[PDB]
Design a protein around this ligand. Structure first.
Ligand SMILES: [Mg+2]
Ligand SMILES: [Mg+2]
Ligand SMILES: [Mg+2]
Ligand SMILES: [Mg+2]
Ligand SMILES: [Mg+2]
Ligand SMILES: [Mg+2]
Ligand SMILES: [Mg+2]
Ligand SMILES: [Mg+2]
Ligand SMILES: [Mg+2]
Ligand SMILES: [Mg+2]
Ligand SMILES: [Mg+2]
Ligand SMILES: [Mg+2]
Ligand SMILES: [Mg+2]
Ligand SMILES: [Mg+2]
Ligand SMILES: [Mg+2]
Ligand SMILES: [Mg+2]
Ligand SMILES: [Mg+2]
Ligand SMILES: [Mg+2]
Ligand SMILES: [Mg+2]
Ligand SMILES: [Mg+2]
Ligand SMILES: [Mg+2]
Ligand SMILES: [Mg+2]
Ligand SMILES: [Mg+2]
Ligand SMILES: [Mg+2]
Ligand SMILES: [Mg+2]
Ligand SMILES: [Mg+2]
Ligand SMILES: [Mg+2]
Ligand SMILES: [Mg+2]
Ligand SMILES: [Mg+2]
Ligand SMILES: [Mg+2]
Ligand SMILES: [Mg+2]
Ligand SMILES: [Mg+2]
Ligand SMILES: [Mg+2]
Ligand SMILES: [Mg+2]
Ligand SMILES: [Mg+2]
Ligand SMILES: [Mg+2]
Ligand SMILES: [Mg+2]
Ligand SMILES: [Mg+2]
Ligand SMILES: [Mg+2]
Ligand SMILES: [Mg+2]
Lengths: 51, 64, 76, 96
RNA sequence: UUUUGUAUAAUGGGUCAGCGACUUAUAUUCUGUAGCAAGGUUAACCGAAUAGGGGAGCCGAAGGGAAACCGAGUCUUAACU
RNA sequence: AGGACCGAACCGACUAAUGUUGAAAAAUUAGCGGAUGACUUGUGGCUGGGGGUGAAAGGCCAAUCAAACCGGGAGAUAGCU
RNA sequence: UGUAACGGGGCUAAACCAUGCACCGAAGCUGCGGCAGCGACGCUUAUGCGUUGUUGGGUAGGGGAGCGUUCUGUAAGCCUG
RNA sequence: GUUUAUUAAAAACACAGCACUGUGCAAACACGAAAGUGGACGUAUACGGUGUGACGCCUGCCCGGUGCCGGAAGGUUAAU
RNA sequence: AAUUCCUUGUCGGGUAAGUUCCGACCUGCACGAAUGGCGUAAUGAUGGCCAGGCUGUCUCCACCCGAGACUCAGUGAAAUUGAACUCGCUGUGAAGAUGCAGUGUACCCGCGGCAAGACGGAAAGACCCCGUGAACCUUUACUAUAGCUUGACACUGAACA
RNA sequence: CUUUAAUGUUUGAUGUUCUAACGUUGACCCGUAAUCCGGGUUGCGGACAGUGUCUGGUGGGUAGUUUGACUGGGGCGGUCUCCUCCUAAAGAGUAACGGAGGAGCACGAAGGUUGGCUAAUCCUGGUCGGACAUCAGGAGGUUAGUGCAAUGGCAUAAGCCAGCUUGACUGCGAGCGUGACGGCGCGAGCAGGUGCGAAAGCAGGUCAUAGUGAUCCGGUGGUUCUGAAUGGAAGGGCCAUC
């Protein structure tokens, strides 16, 4: 409900992604969060993208 | 004539060693972002058909 | 405007009573708030379910200055 | 399968899998089968003649089933760790 | 007969005689029973024809896995307490 | 002269009674309208079933027409009795 | 519609309270005899029989055991002018 | 005049009369996979459709919606 | 008002008395101009109203004449029907009883008559509901389609600008 | 080459003509003592019209079907999923077109952790200031507060700040709860990697309970799977996801 689904993508080469939502209006910039990439088995920066 | 297999059943159940049937869990097809990772984790593995349902499945897979 | 609605009963309540012997993990109470609080060898989950952290016998007690209800588990 | 109108179990739940065309031309051989071939040499050909595997079979694995009481030779067949020991305990030879 | 319930003023039958309704085929499972038994059994056909021949097949003695595959283990998982 | 008047034959069918297991699956009796006209009647022909024909009522199409009749699909289907 | 607001007759208790002891009263209990199911045990086990507890209202329905009809074999047998 | 043969004969249908409107003839329109045919051996003072219903006095306002007639510039637009 | 709900509107006429009829009013619940308005002589087995005559339509029925009905002879059906030794009352009761209870009454059988009951006969209710029944019918419901219409190619060529 | 004309040239567009396809329901001859048909001639039209295949529109003209259930008959009205309280008879559960209400979201902080804090309301005093703003004292004691409905909770705060952060982790999971099933839920603990803290320790979202949609078909990314002679590829499976 106005809250859009986005995917956070692994900054390593893997194509691993977490999925979440965003109020794309009030918080229009790209969400960037450290999370665990299970393919390299290490925590890596993840950066917002479209779904 | 030969009984005809209910084919969508046969595309959803497989018979196991002691005579049961294995099947894939419901609820892991789409609308995923909202579902807890735990719930989806526990739906990945296959499961056994419950007792109440064996009559139905067996009726549908006479050649299993 | 107009009535006619209700929700499913959540089947809450005490699941193992005083003395019942349980293996760890067994839910002892389903509750909304902490009517019973978790005591020794008892855990409290996110919906305030109290559960066993050890094999033993369920033990209800009342402790402390607020006379709160506590559940613990005695080794048997 | 009809359940009164409710979305039935064979629809309720999702489909899975694919069928391997290779599994169907791939067969398993028991140790109890090794003596049943006229000649003490086990190939696909040996086994087909003794009517132990089907004609259209292209691959086979000897499994640890039954026992083996005769030195036997196997060839072009996969052998499980156990089966290899049982054949060899009885003097057999496993050649590719 | 149907029914919560029918002396019911609820249904059917004026009476007799004869006819009148869970069958059959092929599959499939379970029980009983008979054979044989880690085996069991043949189909079409052949035929000296209910014999005998015929073992193409089918079921079973091995499972796990979506599959490759592995195998008394396999899958899961980088790995499993 | 008149889809003119009165009135039999002819054609029709407004009332009433009778009849209603009838004399009759639509009539009888007394009365009633038209009666040279968009009249009436004989023989024979044509129009065929989602089709005909209809001064139109869903009327008529061989005593049952909001889709004729016979045979067929045919043991339609019947969670009803 | 007719006594019709004890079922009736009738009753001053044959009504009401209270006490008491009698008796009637059922397919309930007991008695005599009998059958079956299920047990057990036995005189003695070829599974029957024998003793002996106990059970035996029943719809939908499940289970068991049977009678009897027509037809094949037994049967060129057996009964039958 | 007509009508529901057989529960409705009327205020229903028809009707002359009126209007709208289509039709230039190989007409429109109808029956027909077609050929063929009615229309008509007719030709806009004719033919079809539709609504009104002798006659007398009359028939006002609305084109926004629906329908039809007309339009060619743009926008949108099929096979290709 | 073939239209007016309220409504027997109101007023006037007729009548001894008129929810209708005639005439008016306008407050048209909800007339209105060819899905025609208003009128109209004549016409009509057409609707409403009124009056002369008329009479058994009625007060209120009498008598008579014929055909039946009844008796005798001949022929000789029908619907229906579980079986009947087939009464009344009050009550009971699948809730409206010849059949149960209690009571009252009643000697056996016909014949002519009536229709209160047998929830009398007759047709597996037409109203009402249900069925994931049926059929026609309507439409700016859905999907298709004849038709009508649009254009691309094909049958379909040449020449000059 | 810079430009520019015109002849001469390819295919379109647009015309204007022609005739030889096609039309002729004009006239004529013949088959023929024939208002058919055919062939001939002739005029009239002419690449049009018309027909075939393809295609847009139109199409109740025709056709096949759909058009819900609950319901103190039906219709109208209302209602259909989910959460909370009551009815509910002190475990669970429990009906009604019973009685009240509320959801179909929100938050990258309003999540994690460490450190810290404690409301509401009244009296008295106080510039503008008021019945009520901000300041102070006292009383009070959670009557506050919780992103929101109700109930249950909450000071050890779950209520209010701040710093550092991404555990709103990936793989699993003893053992439980609740369900006809599909499913839903709670869960210590294990592995890997992580945040906060000196540390013991906490963290697998939010005080909990609503905030939702099975299957199929199909999109996107990944992939030691599969790859119809063979190597590839397409399609398929597998993980994620829409
Ligand atoms: Mg998926
Ligand atoms: Mg449904
Ligand atoms: Mg073989
Ligand atoms: Mg009843
Ligand atoms: Mg019953
Ligand atoms: Mg009866
Ligand atoms: Mg009867
Ligand atoms: Mg005349
Ligand atoms: Mg007459
Ligand atoms: Mg006359
Ligand atoms: Mg005739
Ligand atoms: Mg058929
Ligand atoms: Mg039938
Ligand atoms: Mg008395
Ligand atoms: Mg006494
Ligand atoms: Mg006795
Ligand atoms: Mg007894
Ligand atoms: Mg008639
Ligand atoms: Mg009549
Ligand atoms: Mg008219
Ligand atoms: Mg006008
Ligand atoms: Mg236009
Ligand atoms: Mg008047
Ligand atoms: Mg007349
Ligand atoms: Mg006589
Ligand atoms: Mg009776
Ligand atoms: Mg009757
Ligand atoms: Mg009926
Ligand atoms: Mg009926
Ligand atoms: Mg063209
Ligand atoms: Mg239709
Ligand atoms: Mg309903
Ligand atoms: Mg409770
Ligand atoms: Mg209780
Ligand atoms: Mg703290
Ligand atoms: Mg103050
Ligand atoms: Mg540290
Ligand atoms: Mg919070
Ligand atoms: Mg290929
Ligand atoms: Mg290949």
């Amino acid at each position: 409900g106005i809250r859009e689904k986005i995917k956070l993508v692994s900054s390593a080469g893997t194509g691993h992604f977490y999925t979440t939502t965003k109020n794309k209006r009030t918080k229009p910039e790209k969400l960037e969060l450290k999370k665990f990439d299970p393919v390299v088995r290490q925590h890596v920066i993840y950066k917002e993208a479209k779904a | 004539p030969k009984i005809k297999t209910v084919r969508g059943a046969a595309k959803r159940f497989k018979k196991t060693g002691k005579g049961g049937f294995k099947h894939k869990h419901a609820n892991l097809r789409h609308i995923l972002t909202k579902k807890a990772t735990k719930r989806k984790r526990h739906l990945r593995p296959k499961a056994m058909v419950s007792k109440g349902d064996l009559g139905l499945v067996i009726a549908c897979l006479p050649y299993a | 405007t107009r009535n006619g609605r209700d929700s499913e009963a959540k089947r809450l309540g005490v699941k193992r009573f005083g003395g019942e012997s349980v293996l760890a993990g067994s839910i002892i109470v389903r509750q909304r708030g902490t009517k019973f609080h978790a005591g020794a060898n008892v855990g409290c989950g996110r919906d305030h379910t109290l559960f066993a952290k050890a094999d033993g016998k369920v033990k209800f007690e009342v402790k402390g200055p607020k006379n709160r209800k506590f559940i613990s588990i005695e080794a048997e | 399968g009809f359940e009164g109108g409710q979305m039935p179990l064979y629809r309720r739940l999702p489909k899975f899998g694919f069928t391997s065309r290779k599994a169907a031309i791939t067969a398993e051989i028991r140790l109890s089968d090794l003596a049943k071939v006229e000649g003490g040499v086990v190939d696909l050909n040996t086994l087909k003649a003794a009517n132990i595997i089907g004609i259209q079979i292209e691959f086979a694995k000897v499994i640890l089933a039954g026992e083996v009481t005769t030195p036997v030779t196997v060839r072009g067949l996969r052998v499980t760790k156990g089966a290899r020991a049982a054949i060899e305990a009885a003097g057999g030879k496993i050649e590719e």
